[PDB]
């Protein structure tokens, strides 16, 4: 039986270690594109599909910035400007973090706002969430107060009070 | 007699694991285009559907933010874009809560509107609803407080007592 | 005797399973749409009507929201969008409801109304009504709070005292 | 003797069905088009009009709120839209309410007006008619309460002694 077909290479093998991994008999074959296909045994398809969702897999395609074509049919000025600013940050950020020997995958959501309340009253909201996933074999919880001031020190107006950091292993 | 046709390999994976779980004898076939058919002996037939509908097969499809053509022709502001962007924020905590290990699905709802009440008063509703499924093999209950940080800290202007976090086992 | 033709295979199975259940000889065949035609003997054609209408079969079509051409030819601003805004959001609590195991259907119709009295006067209409039918052999009496917590949290202005959640057993 | 040609399959099989629970001999016709023909023995002709007069056969069309065309040519603003919307709402509840098992037909007629009495003078009218028959064979005399409460938060502004709710047999 077919899982999934027009896997990446990547997406490929990481679902075919884990359902090797938990003697499921999975197979592959590649297409013409490059692209590949995971089947295994009827007898096997209710627990792999089991282990495949219990794992997040196949990964969901959320909401593609770029793609704000639906939403608007121009920009000459500032939210979505400012988005694609916190964007290119987050983007940064993740860049750099990712840098540090055990982190396996990183995700930052910044916030920063400057609101007009009403006259003579503005209001400014700061604050960074960052998830990181280190490696099985790398224990990354002493190393959390300098992700939290490499993070507080790459965005305006942040203080380390605002700043969300969970690692999780993978 | 037939159950369903043109079902994803996972759709039909899923309700053909579920059937055969509860000593359904179905059977599958795939069409031209790879979408795949679903069928029962007839003497089975009234408890397919009784236990396809009781497990919320098959999933329906639900209003698309995208599929906004019928409601208006052009945005230039704020309403169409603030639901876009608001909508990006709920795939982006989807996608970051989604790798935490246990997680198999996971639905945000975000509420942040920005109103005038009348001249010289300005309300701010905040709040979020997070649902979660997790594997049943993983607790996820002790995750509660670290997925409500995860959201509180995602999200303008959110405090914890107005976020709702539920986890429920598949 | 004829009872309906192009019926969906799901419309036809849960009929053609409903009239099996309560001795009633039916016969089904499938035209060349894949659509589905029902027959009973003429004998058992009164019984089969009075069956098929004391259990909502076959389901009426209501209005569409899409369906708003009759109405106005063109959107450019608020209560059209409103509408559709409220719509998208019933049909996302309905999606998310709809996972929690043991529910079969589910119905969400929301108030949220931003009314200006007069002069100085801003009235705001808040409340929530949802419908769910459960499998027999569920019972989510139980979920009823989790459930009003979920409405409650994934929609602006609510509060519990105006959320009606009732619960029917298929 | 011919009674009706044109019938659809339901209409038809509850005439003929009522007729032969009342020893009328009435036979019945398809044509091209898979509408039906009923006529019955001259002798019984006036005795099967009588009791179709009696049991409302054939139903009457009503006015349609779509075949507007002849009130007016196009609508930019409210009270055209506002019926439309009402119309929308009026059809939900009778989707939702038809869900209820011994439900067999239902009757939504809503009243939600907003009217200026003069400056400064701002009315709200608001209620609601619903009528349910049920199945001979079921009692939904005790679903009542729970009826009109899933109606009154359905709707904008309404309370429970401004809804009619009235249940009467087949």
Not at 73 to 100: C, G, H
Not at 132 to 161: C, M, T, W
């Amino acid at each position: 039986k077919d899982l999934l077909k027009g896997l990446d290479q990547e997406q490929a093998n990481e679902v075919i270690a884990v359902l090797q991994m938990h003697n499921i008999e999975a197979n592959k074959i590649d297409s013409g594109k490059l692209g590949y296909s995971i089947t295994v045994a009827e007898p096997d398809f209710t627990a792999a599909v089991y282990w495949i969702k219990t794992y997040q897999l196949p990964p969901r395609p959320r909401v593609e910035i770029a793609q704000m074509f639906p939403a608007d049919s121009l920009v000459s000025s500032p939210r979505a400007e400012k988005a694609r600013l916190y964007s290119a940050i987050e983007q940064r950020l993740e860049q750099s973090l990712q840098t540090m020997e055990g982190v396996l995958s990183a995700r930052v959501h910044i916030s920063y706002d400057i609101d007009a309340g009403e006259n003579g009253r503005p209001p400014k909201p700061v604050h960074l969430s960052a998830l990181a996933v280190y490696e099985r074999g790398s224990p990354l919880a002493h190393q959390i107060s300098d992700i939290k001031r490499f993070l507080k020190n790459s965005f305006a107006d942040v203080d380390y009070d605002n700043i969300s950091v969970v690692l999780s292993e993978r």
